Amino acid sequence: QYYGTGRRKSSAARVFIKPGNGKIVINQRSLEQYFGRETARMVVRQPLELVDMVEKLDLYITVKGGGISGQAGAIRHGITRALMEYDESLRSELRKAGFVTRDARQVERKKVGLRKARRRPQFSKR
Amino acid sequence: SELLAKFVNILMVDGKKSTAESIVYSALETLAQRSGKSELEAFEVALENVRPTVEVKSRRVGGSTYQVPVEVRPVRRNALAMRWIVEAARKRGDKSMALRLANELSDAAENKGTAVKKREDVHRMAEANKAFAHYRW
Amino acid sequence: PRSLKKGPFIDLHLLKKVEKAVESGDKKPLRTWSRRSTIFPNMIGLTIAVHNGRQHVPVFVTDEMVGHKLGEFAPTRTYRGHAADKK
Amino acid sequence: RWNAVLKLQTLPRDSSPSRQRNRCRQTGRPHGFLRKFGLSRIKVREAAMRGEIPGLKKASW
Amino acid sequence: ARIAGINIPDHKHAVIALTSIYGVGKTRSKAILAAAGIAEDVKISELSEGQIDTLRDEVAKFVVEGDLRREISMSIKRLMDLGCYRGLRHRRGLPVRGQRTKTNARTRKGPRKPI
Amino acid sequence: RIRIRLKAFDHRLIDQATAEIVETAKRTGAQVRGPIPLPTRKERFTVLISPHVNKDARDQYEIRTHLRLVDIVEPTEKTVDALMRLDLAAGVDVQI
RNA sequence: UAUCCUUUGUUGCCAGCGGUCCGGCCGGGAACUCAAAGGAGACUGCCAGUGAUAACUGGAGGAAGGUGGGGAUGACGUCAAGUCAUCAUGGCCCUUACGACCAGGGCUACACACGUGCUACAAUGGCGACUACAAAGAGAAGCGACCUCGCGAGAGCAAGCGGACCUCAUAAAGUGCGUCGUAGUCCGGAUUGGAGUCUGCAACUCGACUCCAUGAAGUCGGAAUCGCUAGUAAUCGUGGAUCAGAAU
């Protein structure tokens, strides 16, 4: 068995890799069940595709907080870092994609004097 | 099919993928019951009949604005075809959304309506200026 | 050009007793001389008698009456209204 | 009333000396007073702003 | 269907169908239907003839219509005949000012209006 | 086995007293589990620098309350005599 | 605000074992999350094309690249820009008064005309129920658990804390389920009538909220016009600074 945390926005999804069929359990619920009807649910199992696992590995995820998206990206990183423990050599390839990495873009209150707390109020052509 | 995976995004009238696709598949279901054809095939043909080929652009070439015909990229034809189908279905009168789509996808194959009028209008705009054709761009 | 800000004038005498009758509800009609005082909540439901200069007239205070002076509900002069005085 | 302010009377009624309450000195409000100054909560403020009260100062933030 | 003071709640759910009566509303709707045992998801055109009967007799016992409005008029007439400003407020035909209003006040009113 | 939590506002006056309590106990008593920092609860206030205009100012202030552990085990008679007598730190609140 | 690492942890977690009123709660240990400090990292270096070069364009590697995303910050100088009621200051101008105390009457007058704004008309939007996560602050007569009356506000009553141990708090959304698909239909909630609590010495004009009833305009709305590009737009809810107290 191997463990993989996984961070993103404000969600934490622990990943427990266990050699088996290929089914995963998201909060005592199947993958399709939890992430029911969501084109993004696929990106969650992307890291398992590169190194080609899934059909060889069974996972047990435990996420909490944030939204499905943040969870999807959370489980991802968790699975990626979890694959590292199984075989460090996987890093050389898995890393290439960019799964062994979280992400900022953490929502921030729209700063005043601006609009997106990021974009400043442009000026009408000089 | 990705096409349906995309059409379910626009027809996803207000990101409700949960029920959004509920009306989709329900439309293809009643489509096969109303028409003796596969829901898939009867779907693709609906988007093919709604795609422009040559778009005309304005150009104030020194003197005045000149309408010069230009070819359209296969990246915008998909978006437009998809967009004009959901708007047309939302123009019908039947009290069933799943039916407005099924009927729209059917009439789209039969060809006729506003969407077709625009196609002809643009087609008429072309050739009517086949002079600037040497400016194929 | 009325004015009260945060300094209402409630004769310390007709204000201490009106609060005394609040121990358990209200008390029968009372009588006050200084009409300069202003009507307020605590005096709701009670029947204060203002001095018109000759006698004390019963003025049943009401929430809608709050804010106005007791003297405003106590007419000084007395006009018979020489007529069928209807309505 | 001038009658209600019977507190001024050193000798209380039938009740024991404990009968004597307080009563403000400026306004005479028995509700909320301040032993130290003997003034009510509405007088200690008006007297504070005026500065008539020595040693007293408005707390800031 | 017919119930109290001439009401025609047609093509509506048994619930709001009564929420159109100046007397009863939402709260009274759920209570009246729960006491008479009637589905709140049934149209007024699907209600049996025996269900409406048990609905009319129970709703009958209530205060509505003119008899109630007259009580309002009397309540506005009692303080109107007295020397209450509120009563005169309802009229508003009294002086809004500070000069007189009885006469010599056409500079604000304008041409004399009919009595 | 006596735990001594040292808390205060000033960071320096703590290191002085804390180190003292240790050194003095390093002789008579054990070597002590060593004085650690531990988490410090902080309180910050964001008020505009300038009094008029300039809303984007608001400088950052903070009133920290550092803590310590020390913890002296295997206490001896003299181990405490070197504590009750010497006590300099004034802004430090001891808790034995 | 992210990648990673080092230091520390009564925030965290059977990640791992044991107990468990199965609530980390406890034993226990610091991995993880998180808190704090320091440090590591893109520099166009590498590859192809163009060019005198810079550099531009494409590509690989790479967590991110050509100022990765953002704040505070606004020059020689401009408009003789704003402010002498923040303060300082040259000149000028008043001392029974253009000084001071106090009571009362307002700032919330119209036949019309204008500018700037708010309310106006669902079904990712919302509603009904259920349920799972955050950070930063505030509280003495004040924050107000809990109980009782009200489809209520908030009362009557009343515990606790003085506060990283009590309260404001419910985080909203999400998650699971259901309703609906354009019919003025419990959809939408304006307006209005009645009853009524309260903050406040007062709330008719100026209130918040809601019991009770009524319940329109709408089914994406004339001439025009505004903000926005990825977790962003639109949309929903919460906190704080100012502050005795009315903060759309």
Tab-separated table of N, CA, C and O (backbone and C1' of nucleotides) in Angstrom, chain G residues 91-116:
chain	number	residue	atom	x	y	z
G	91	G	P	1.776	89.473	8.119
G	91	G	O5'	0.680	89.987	7.083
G	91	G	C5'	1.046	90.823	5.990
G	91	G	C4'	-0.143	91.060	5.087
G	91	G	C3'	-1.394	91.592	5.767
G	91	G	O3'	-1.337	93.006	5.915
G	91	G	C1'	-1.975	89.811	4.326
G	92	C	P	-2.213	93.723	7.056
G	92	C	O5'	-3.717	93.502	6.582
G	92	C	C5'	-4.197	94.089	5.375
G	92	C	C4'	-5.574	93.564	5.047
G	92	C	C3'	-6.619	93.721	6.139
G	92	C	O3'	-7.209	95.015	6.096
G	92	C	C1'	-6.696	91.519	5.284
G	93	C	P	-7.741	95.693	7.451
G	93	C	O5'	-9.043	94.853	7.817
G	93	C	C5'	-10.205	94.908	6.993
G	93	C	C4'	-11.250	93.942	7.498
G	93	C	C3'	-11.620	94.090	8.965
G	93	C	O3'	-12.627	95.082	9.137
G	93	C	C1'	-11.196	91.814	8.485
G	94	C	P	-12.779	95.827	10.553
G	94	C	O5'	-14.025	95.109	11.239
G	94	C	C5'	-14.291	95.275	12.631
G	94	C	C4'	-15.062	94.088	13.161
G	94	C	C3'	-15.146	93.991	14.677
G	94	C	O3'	-16.258	94.732	15.171
G	94	C	C1'	-14.467	91.906	13.777
G	95	U	P	-16.098	95.626	16.499
G	95	U	O5'	-16.523	94.653	17.689
G	95	U	C5'	-16.466	95.093	19.044
G	95	U	C4'	-16.149	93.935	19.961
G	95	U	C3'	-15.770	94.322	21.383
G	95	U	O3'	-16.931	94.432	22.205
G	95	U	C1'	-14.204	92.757	20.527
G	96	U	P	-17.536	95.897	22.519
G	96	U	O5'	-18.816	95.996	21.576
G	96	U	C5'	-20.102	96.332	22.096
G	96	U	C4'	-20.827	95.081	22.536
G	96	U	C3'	-22.318	95.234	22.789
G	96	U	O3'	-23.024	95.117	21.553
G	96	U	C1'	-21.320	94.032	24.575
G	97	A	P	-24.595	94.776	21.549
G	97	A	O5'	-24.629	93.184	21.609
G	97	A	C5'	-24.463	92.390	20.432
G	97	A	C4'	-23.089	92.609	19.835
G	97	A	C3'	-22.581	91.496	18.931
G	97	A	O3'	-23.069	91.663	17.601
G	97	A	C1'	-20.867	92.186	20.427
G	98	C	P	-23.991	90.525	16.938
G	98	C	O5'	-22.978	89.613	16.112
G	98	C	C5'	-23.414	88.385	15.531
G	98	C	C4'	-22.297	87.751	14.731
G	98	C	C3'	-20.963	87.641	15.446
G	98	C	O3'	-20.932	86.467	16.252
G	98	C	C1'	-20.636	88.453	13.239
G	99	G	P	-21.424	86.542	17.779
G	99	G	O5'	-20.747	85.278	18.472
G	99	G	C5'	-19.357	85.008	18.310
G	99	G	C4'	-18.695	84.871	19.660
G	99	G	C3'	-19.381	83.919	20.626
G	99	G	O3'	-18.963	82.575	20.422
G	99	G	C1'	-18.947	85.958	21.726
G	100	A	P	-19.974	81.373	20.760
G	100	A	O5'	-20.382	81.630	22.278
G	100	A	C5'	-19.459	81.380	23.335
G	100	A	C4'	-20.153	81.480	24.674
G	100	A	C3'	-21.431	80.670	24.817
G	100	A	O3'	-21.147	79.316	25.147
G	100	A	C1'	-21.778	82.850	25.662
G	101	C	P	-22.225	78.174	24.808
G	101	C	O5'	-23.365	78.389	25.901
G	101	C	C5'	-23.131	78.072	27.269
G	101	C	C4'	-24.379	78.311	28.084
G	101	C	C3'	-25.646	77.666	27.551
G	101	C	O3'	-25.738	76.306	27.955
G	101	C	C1'	-26.092	79.912	28.136
G	102	C	P	-26.569	75.262	27.058
G	102	C	O5'	-28.089	75.671	27.307
G	102	C	C5'	-28.661	75.587	28.608
G	102	C	C4'	-30.020	76.244	28.628
G	102	C	C3'	-31.016	75.738	27.596
G	102	C	O3'	-31.683	74.569	28.065
G	102	C	C1'	-31.017	78.105	27.610
G	103	A	P	-32.316	73.536	27.010
G	103	A	O5'	-33.753	74.141	26.687
G	103	A	C5'	-34.824	74.024	27.621
G	103	A	C4'	-36.042	74.763	27.119
G	103	A	C3'	-36.525	74.369	25.730
G	103	A	O3'	-37.394	73.241	25.798
G	103	A	C1'	-36.395	76.724	25.882
G	104	G	P	-37.435	72.189	24.583
G	104	G	O5'	-38.257	72.939	23.443
G	104	G	C5'	-39.654	73.186	23.587
G	104	G	C4'	-40.118	74.186	22.554
G	104	G	C3'	-39.859	73.802	21.104
G	104	G	O3'	-40.926	73.008	20.589
G	104	G	C1'	-39.076	75.996	21.481
G	105	G	P	-40.605	71.776	19.603
G	105	G	O5'	-40.685	72.405	18.141
G	105	G	C5'	-41.930	72.839	17.596
G	105	G	C4'	-41.706	73.972	16.622
G	105	G	C3'	-40.901	73.637	15.372
G	105	G	O3'	-41.765	73.185	14.327
G	105	G	C1'	-40.039	75.604	16.378
G	106	G	P	-41.599	71.702	13.696
G	106	G	O5'	-40.169	71.852	13.002
G	106	G	C5'	-39.683	70.851	12.098
G	106	G	C4'	-38.648	71.444	11.165
G	106	G	C3'	-37.944	70.485	10.214
G	106	G	O3'	-38.704	70.250	9.036
G	106	G	C1'	-36.360	71.941	11.203
G	107	C	P	-38.346	68.993	8.098
G	107	C	O5'	-36.845	69.264	7.628
G	107	C	C5'	-36.547	70.316	6.712
G	107	C	C4'	-35.050	70.476	6.549
G	107	C	C3'	-34.279	69.256	6.073
G	107	C	O3'	-34.329	69.158	4.653
G	107	C	C1'	-33.117	70.300	7.860
G	108	U	P	-34.562	67.727	3.959
G	108	U	O5'	-36.132	67.493	4.086
G	108	U	C5'	-36.848	66.764	3.092
G	108	U	C4'	-38.051	66.092	3.711
G	108	U	C3'	-38.953	67.011	4.520
G	108	U	O3'	-39.917	67.641	3.681
G	108	U	C1'	-38.482	65.046	5.761
G	109	A	P	-39.795	69.212	3.364
G	109	A	O5'	-41.299	69.737	3.387
G	109	A	C5'	-42.120	69.667	2.222
G	109	A	C4'	-42.960	70.918	2.100
G	109	A	C3'	-43.758	71.045	0.812
G	109	A	O3'	-45.009	70.372	0.923
G	109	A	C1'	-42.600	73.064	1.226
G	110	C	P	-45.501	69.399	-0.258
G	110	C	O5'	-45.912	70.389	-1.437
G	110	C	C5'	-46.063	69.908	-2.772
G	110	C	C4'	-46.393	71.051	-3.706
G	110	C	C3'	-46.320	70.711	-5.186
G	110	C	O3'	-47.504	70.041	-5.636
G	110	C	C1'	-45.034	72.647	-4.771
G	111	A	P	-48.864	70.863	-5.909
G	111	A	O5'	-48.796	71.278	-7.447
G	111	A	C5'	-49.986	71.301	-8.234
G	111	A	C4'	-49.692	71.749	-9.649
G	111	A	C3'	-48.605	70.997	-10.397
G	111	A	O3'	-49.117	69.794	-10.962
G	111	A	C1'	-48.371	73.331	-10.754
G	112	C	P	-48.101	68.696	-11.551
G	112	C	O5'	-47.431	69.427	-12.799
G	112	C	C5'	-46.206	68.955	-13.354
G	112	C	C4'	-45.454	70.095	-13.996
G	112	C	C3'	-44.039	69.769	-14.449
G	112	C	O3'	-44.040	69.204	-15.756
G	112	C	C1'	-44.017	71.765	-13.187
G	113	A	P	-42.984	68.050	-16.125
G	113	A	O5'	-41.584	68.808	-16.182
G	113	A	C5'	-41.161	69.475	-17.369
G	113	A	C4'	-39.727	69.930	-17.230
G	113	A	C3'	-38.741	68.856	-16.799
G	113	A	O3'	-38.281	68.096	-17.911
G	113	A	C1'	-38.429	70.778	-15.469
G	114	C	P	-37.680	66.624	-17.675
G	114	C	O5'	-36.217	66.894	-17.105
G	114	C	C5'	-35.269	67.646	-17.857
G	114	C	C4'	-33.967	67.757	-17.098
G	114	C	C3'	-33.337	66.441	-16.674
G	114	C	O3'	-32.553	65.882	-17.723
G	114	C	C1'	-33.372	67.917	-14.833
G	115	G	P	-32.156	64.325	-17.675
G	115	G	O5'	-30.974	64.264	-16.608
G	115	G	C5'	-29.729	64.908	-16.862
G	115	G	C4'	-28.834	64.820	-15.647
G	115	G	C3'	-28.596	63.423	-15.102
G	115	G	O3'	-27.542	62.771	-15.802
G	115	G	C1'	-29.145	64.876	-13.322
G	116	U	P	-27.514	61.166	-15.886
G	116	U	O5'	-27.180	60.706	-14.398
G	116	U	C5'	-25.922	61.011	-13.803
G	116	U	C4'	-25.926	60.630	-12.341
G	116	U	C3'	-26.281	59.182	-12.039
G	116	U	O3'	-25.138	58.340	-12.136
G	116	U	C1'	-27.539	60.607	-10.636
